[PDB]
Design a protein around this nucleic acid. Structure first.
Lengths: 190, 138, 199, 251, 109, 176
RNA sequence: GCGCCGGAGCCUCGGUUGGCCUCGGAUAGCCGGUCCCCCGCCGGGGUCCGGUGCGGAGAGCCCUUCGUCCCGGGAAACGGGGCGGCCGGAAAGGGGGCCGCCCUCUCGCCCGUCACGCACCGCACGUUCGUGGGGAACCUGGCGCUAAACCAUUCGUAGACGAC
RNA sequence: UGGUAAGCAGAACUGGCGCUGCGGGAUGAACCGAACGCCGGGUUAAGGCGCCCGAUGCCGACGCUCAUCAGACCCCAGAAAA
RNA sequence: GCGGUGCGCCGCGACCGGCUCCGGGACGGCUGGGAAGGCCCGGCGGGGAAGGUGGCCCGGGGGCCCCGGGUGUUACAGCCCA
């Protein structure tokens, strides 16, 4: 049927100040401003209370699959706020059997050189999304710490250095080599 | 972002149909796309009416959803919607549109000759306002 | 006596059906900004649809066969062509009245260009139903001059902005030049208002 | 029924229209892509196939079986006397493609170039560019010539230079020189047009265009062989000797 | 001084799909786009004015080149302000999409 | 029965004609939702022949008046019990509507059964129509209008009258 | 013996019968203002103010035209009308807008006076664009322009023949 | 009725086609409507009414459906189990 | 002057009759001697619950005004029945 109204409030923290031009939300706080446009989604984004301490997304006369988009907007703005209060840290770990994978970073964090993967001579230069800073952390044999604000960008660039390290024309159950996303967390904690 | 809402006791202008150019008050919402409506003071009988033919205004007045015509007529005359309508710019340009359609051929001559002189006396002053725009840069 | 129609945010066949009928009634229709014309259903369906059109060629000599015009204009021209008796003289005398453009060239850049709200995407599609741009569809199927059209379109948007900035600047000096003079255009204003040209 | 044994198709359908080239001089269909970072340069020249001879050089490619061994390579000699720049043409970039905006020719055009503008030079009074020449030696003309360059460094985007071959310096029978638009690829359009105007009535030698050990694209017309059968034109199989109506055709 | 006729387009003949009845024409009068609005135009005189090579006599003047086929708007065609008209000569198909002048000369107002 | 336009409810009473054995046969009443009295009296004989040894030949119709609404200006909740033939088997349904009129809910039912299950009105037998109290109405599409404080906007006002200009000079507004 | 500029008409092809000179565009959002802080070389971002079944409305606006005379009242004097320049215009370059004068009126526009003009006697192609498009010649004054192609011959980078 | 079936072969009843135009089914001997002297007006059938193409350019009613192989009208011109 | 006949060609009007398609008024019949509804005051009396009004309690929105729960029969709204 058509549900007359489905809606969902995001309880935003005082550290953050969100505003919206139409349904293009902006989220700024401690460590930068994130903007995500929702021109495609077709909802009523209302910002209520003095000092704007909650975002409220309404969907009038939505069918089942259009009611599904209410929480997905709510979840993005939650992820937009975690990404500005706390940031996003994807601690991901190089697994290898015999050949150690030499991970060295260029371009002050923007590009990762991947060498010696299955003892291959081809060196793989995988770029990060604009606003993700990859690094090699301390007291870790095999570790890439990806850091950025936008979860969309940090995670997409984590998937790039995982799908770069794909074993072609072998059993991938014996050959467990490659750099895999080992942990999804936040840069500065709660 | 919406301001006008289909609510119990919202006055809505009826755009077209049998009761075109009248104010009906939403008594009860029947369906997804149809409302029980009454206009006791604008001579619209208690009846069903679809949302597609009604342009909802910024006049809400308090009566219950079940309320019979007697208690819609009271809240209507109490609010005094028929005068607050005629005051509204919406209703002022409805009667302008009416007057323009009922403009006689002799009535059209008088407003041709009026406009003409009314437009000359501005287009003089637009030319004079614009010499003051030129002069202040020299 | 010449309809200049804008193509931005109009549906392809919906506009063609309304252009073709005007053009058969001896009306010179100029449809302008054809890269703006959009087609209902998601992009990849409409790309497939047009790629399936390219595959249709006269096996023994393709030079004779169906001419696959790439320009958004000439795509739009052809869908109007398909809604005309273009083998008769009245249907050929028709098409000549139709004049179709990518972007918006001289004559019809400094002219007020109409809209067909019964052929208009926002009116006629649900906002969940996906659509394709005839600009993008044309580009990704062999139309070369997308970015040349786009830079020459961005030029005249800035040039037409100067005009609008100047047109607002008169309208303020009209509204102010009405406010100064209302004591000696009173009896004229009154009688525009008793016949509802202002109220 | 099916092709019994699969063989590939005789000849390419790329150059299908196997006709007399409508031009005798090889048109440059595509010039290199210009980036405004580079300094200005001509991107094409116009030479003459003199002949063909050996070379002997020592090859220098490591790993090969001819590394630090001498080879004998076949080479062509393209005689390329320096070309005289006699005009500049501007191109406006349009949504119907790329339109020629304005041509400005030089003041003094040599009779090598003039010959190109006549079918019968002998019968002609040789009047070409005699009223155009007058634009360069009056104040009222120089004004409107410099307003053409001004107009062209505003709207035009692709500047090509007109350079004709210096036919007198060759051993050939003909005197009618070959004109050619050669695209100037370089910096900004302003720098490109100041430069081409500076080169107007100048020799451009081939060292100014090309350098040694440079891979270049040679454009010309193929050596003409007249009306040929399918066995010569397409290199199809010759049919059996016992063929009645001819063994030199497609069955 | 001014125009005393309303702008009509000779859209085509009264036809089926595979049969046309040339005796009745289908006018498209400018402004009227419903059977409601076409009540005014019924019984009105309408002229296909054209001009030919030879000077034909003009009533109330000297011979011009301009000629007429005088018609009459008979009734409302279709649902959308189209109108049937019937001419003293079946109109030539030369005039399909060309201007005919529905006059207010048989007034009822 | 062709469910032509808005249906009417007809109270049709009819009795098997008086035999010597049965001088005073019992009268049988029905609720026939039909376009008009001529097809209401046909649909009477359809159902009464399925329930009794009674044909139009061995019987007569004694009264066929339209039952009118005794509250046509009150919005009510109608629970309609169906019996319709699918393509593969016949099925019982309970169905809930929200109209001013009984016949209108049963009208609204015939359209819906066509819309959702492609049931033509000949397939459908209506066996029970009942006005229900809000608290006894299970289907959630009808319950969502049991709201004293009902409040929704008319969000995306897709303008009709698309051919009044046909050629305008303004993109139309769909935020009213 | 033809190109640019400046009377009396002949044909021939016809259609038409006031102009709109331009924001971008959004659509679960707009539009116009705006003083106040901000960046920008006057353009943007806010703020607040209005408008929003678009009235700074294409349900729109602009032009609206029997004509002339005399005399008033508004409106105009920064106006109107044609002569030397200043200042504008590439996607398929245009009729614009400015200040200066040689400049002619105090007429035009809106009311109200004074009456006059084939008032052709009830009647159709009337009223425009239009000194339209095209083709011939007839007059006339400036400013001026003195070519080439094809054949023939020749070549052989070409070639059945033309062509090249 | 024979035959796996067939635009196959063979019967019953009635109506068609053949002998027959006409409106509709884009196009068809037979389907659908309807049978014909030559014409004007009116009205319909069966079918339709975005444009081709006469007619929805009604502010038609309520749903249903998204297909990267949509679906779209007797005979009829392409699909099943799952 | 009347009766009859015609107009050189191109047109117009008028009233009358035939057939038409429309439009606008006004009158009456029938019904469950329509059903609902309007207005008298929701008439004195008793009754029920809810898509629950006020009041009260709870949750916090605003500079004391407003909403989201809870309780429940008229209250500072109405509704259904006898």
């Amino acid at each position: 049927m058509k549900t007359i109204l489905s809606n969902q409030t995001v309880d935003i923290p005082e550290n953050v100040d969100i505003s919206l031009k139409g349904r293009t939300v902006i989220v700024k706080g401690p460590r930068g401003t994130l903007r995500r446009d929702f021109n495609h989604i077709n909802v009523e984004l209302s910002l209520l209370g003095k000092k704007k301490k909650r975002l409220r997304v309404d969907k009038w006369w939505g069918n089942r699959k259009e009611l599904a988009t209410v929480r997905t907007i709510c979840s993005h703005v939650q992820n937009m706020i975690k990404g500005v209060t706390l940031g996003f840290r994807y601690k991901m770990r190089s697994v290898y059997a015999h050949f150690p994978i030499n991970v060295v970073i260029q371009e002050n964090g923007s590009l990762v050189e991947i060498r010696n993967f299955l003892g291959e001579k081809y060196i793989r230069r995988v770029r990060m999304r604009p606003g993700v800073a990859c690094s090699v952390s301390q007291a870790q044999k095999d570790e890439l710490v990806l850091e950025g604000n936008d979860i969309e960008l940090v995670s997409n660039s984590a998937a790039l250095i995982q799908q770069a390290t794909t074993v072609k024309n072998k059993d991938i159950r014996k050959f467990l080599d490659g750099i895999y996303v080992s942990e999804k967390g936040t840069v500065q904690q709660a | 972002v919406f301001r006008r809402f289909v609510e119990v006791g919202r006055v809505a202008y009826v755009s077209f149909g049998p009761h075109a150019g009248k104010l009906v008050a939403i008594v009860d919402v029947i369906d997804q796309n149809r409302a029980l409506v009454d206009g006791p003071c604008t001579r619209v009988r208690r009846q069903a009416m679809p949302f597609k033919c009604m342009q909802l205004t910024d006049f809400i007045l308090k009566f219950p959803h079940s309320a019979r015509q007697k208690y819609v007529r009271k809240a209507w005359e109490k609010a005094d919607i028929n005068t607050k309508w005629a005051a509204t710019r919406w209703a002022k340009k409805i009667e302008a549109r009416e007057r323009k359609a009922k403009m006689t051929d002799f009535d059209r001559y008088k407003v041709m000759k009026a406009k003409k002189m009314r437009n000359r006396i501005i287009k003089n002053e637009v030319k004079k306002l614009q010499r003051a725009a030129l002069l202040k840069a020299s | 006596q010449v309809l200049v129609l804008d193509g931005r945010g109009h549906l392809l066949g919906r506009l063609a059906a309304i252009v073709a009928k005007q053009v058969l009634l001896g009306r010179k229709v100029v449809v302008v900004r054809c890269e703006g014309i959009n087609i209902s259903g998601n992009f990849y369906r409409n790309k497939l649809k047009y790629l399936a059109f390219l595959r249709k060629r006269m096996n023994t000599n393709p030079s004779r066969g169906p001419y696959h015009f790439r320009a958004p204009s000439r795509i739009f021209w052809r869908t109007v062509r398909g809604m005309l008796p273009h083998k008769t003289k009245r249907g050929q005398a028709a098409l000549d009245r139709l004049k179709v453009f990518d972007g918006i060239p001289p004559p019809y850049d400094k002219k007020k260009r109409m809209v067909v709200p019964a052929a208009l995407k926002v009116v006629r599609l649900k906002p969940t139903r996906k659509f394709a741009y005839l600009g993008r569809l044309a580009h990704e199927v062999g139309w070369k001059y997308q970015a040349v059209t786009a830079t020459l379109e961005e030029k005249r948007k800035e040039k037409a902005k100067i005009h609008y900035r100047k047109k607002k600047q008169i309208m303020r000096l009209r509204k102010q030049a009405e406010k100064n003079v209302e004591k000696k255009i009173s009896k004229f204003t009154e009688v525009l208002k008793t016949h509802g040209l202002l109220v | 029924s099916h092709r019994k044994f699969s063989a590939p198709r005789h000849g390419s359908l790329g150059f299908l229209p196997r006709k007399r080239s409508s031009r005798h001089r090889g048109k440059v269909k595509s010039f290199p892509k210009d980036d405004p970072s580079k300094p200005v340069h001509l991107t094409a020249f116009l030479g003459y196939k003199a002949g063909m001879t050996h070379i002997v050089r020592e090859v220098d490619r490591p790993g090969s079986k001819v590394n630090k061994k001498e080879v004998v390579e076949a080479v062509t000699i393209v005689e390329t006397p320096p070309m005289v720049v006699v005009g500049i043409v501007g191109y406006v970039e349009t949504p119907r493609g790329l339109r020629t905006f304005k041509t400005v020719f030089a003041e003094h055009i040599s009779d090598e170039c003039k010959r190109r503008f006549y079918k019968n030079w002998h019968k002609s009074k040789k009047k070409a560019f005699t009223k155009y020449c007058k634009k360069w030696q009056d104040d009222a003309g120089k004004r409107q010539l410099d307003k053409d360059f001004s107009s062209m460094k505003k709207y035009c985007q692709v500047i090509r230079v007109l350079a004709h071959t210096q036919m007198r310096l060759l051993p050939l029978r003909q005197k009618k020189a070959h004109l050619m638009e050669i695209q100037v690829n370089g910096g900004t359009v302003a720098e490109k047009l100041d430069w081409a105007r500076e080169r107007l009535e100048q020799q451009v030698p081939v060292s100014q265009v090309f350098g040694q050990d440079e891979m270049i694209d040679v454009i010309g017309v193929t050596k003409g062989k007249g009306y040929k059968g399918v066995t010569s034109r397409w290199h199809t199989k010759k049919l059996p000797r016992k063929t009645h109506r001819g063994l030199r055709k497609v069955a | 001084s001014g125009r005393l006729w309303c702008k009509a387009i000779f859209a085509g003949y009264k036809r089926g799909l595979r049969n046309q009845r040339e005796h009745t024409a289908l006018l498209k009068i400018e402004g009227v786009y419903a059977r409601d609005e076409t009540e005014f135009y019924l019984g009105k005189r309408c002229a296909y004015v054209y001009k030919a090579k030879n000077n034909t006599v003009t009533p109330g003047g000297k011979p011009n080149k301009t000629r007429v086929i005088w018609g009459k708007v008979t009734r409302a065609h279709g649902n959308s302000g189209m109108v049937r008209a019937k001419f003293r000569s079946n109109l030539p198909a030369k005039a399909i999409g060309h201007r005919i002048r529905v006059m207010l000369y048989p007034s009822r107002i | 029965t062709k469910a032509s336009g808005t249906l009417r409810e007809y109270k049709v009473v009819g009795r098997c004609l008086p035999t010597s054995k049965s001088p005073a046969p019992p009268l049988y009443r029905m609720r026939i939702f039909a376009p008009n009295h001529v097809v209401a009296k046909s649909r009477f004989w359809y159902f009464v022949l399925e329930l009794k040894k009674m044909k139009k030949s061995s019987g007569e119709i004694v009264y066929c008046g339209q039952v009118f609404e005794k509250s046509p200006l009150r919005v009510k909740n109608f629970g309609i019990w169906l019996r319709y033939d699918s393509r593969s088997g016949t099925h019982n349904m309970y169905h809930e509507y929200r109209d001013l009129i009984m016949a209108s809910a049963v009208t609204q039912c015939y359209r819906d059964m066509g819309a959702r299950h492609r049931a033509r009105a000949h397939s459908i037998q209506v066996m029970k129509v009942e006005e229900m109290a809000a608290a006894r109405c299970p289907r959630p599409a009808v319950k969502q209008f049991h709201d004293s404080r009902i409040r929704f906007p008319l969000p995306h006002r897709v303008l009709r009258r698309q051919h009044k200009p046909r050629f305008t000079a303004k993109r139309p507004n769909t935020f009213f």
